[PDB]
Tab-separated table of N, CA and C in Angstrom:
chain	number	residue	atom	x	y	z
A	22	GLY	N	-6.601	-117.695	-22.035
A	22	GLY	CA	-6.840	-118.795	-23.191
A	22	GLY	C	-5.792	-118.846	-24.282
A	23	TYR	N	-6.207	-120.105	-25.318
A	23	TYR	CA	-4.635	-120.040	-26.066
A	23	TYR	C	-5.515	-120.414	-27.351
A	24	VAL	N	-4.397	-120.447	-28.288
A	24	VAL	CA	-4.302	-120.700	-29.305
A	24	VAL	C	-3.263	-121.264	-29.730
A	25	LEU	N	-3.020	-122.617	-30.754
A	25	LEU	CA	-2.016	-123.026	-30.976
A	25	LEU	C	-2.565	-123.818	-32.933
A	26	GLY	N	-1.662	-123.370	-33.723
A	26	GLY	CA	-2.160	-123.693	-35.023
A	26	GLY	C	-0.843	-124.287	-35.675
A	27	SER	N	-1.047	-124.965	-36.847
A	27	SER	CA	-0.037	-125.782	-37.761
A	27	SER	C	-0.205	-126.075	-39.066
């Protein structure tokens, strides 16, 4: 899985 945040 993956997580991106900004």
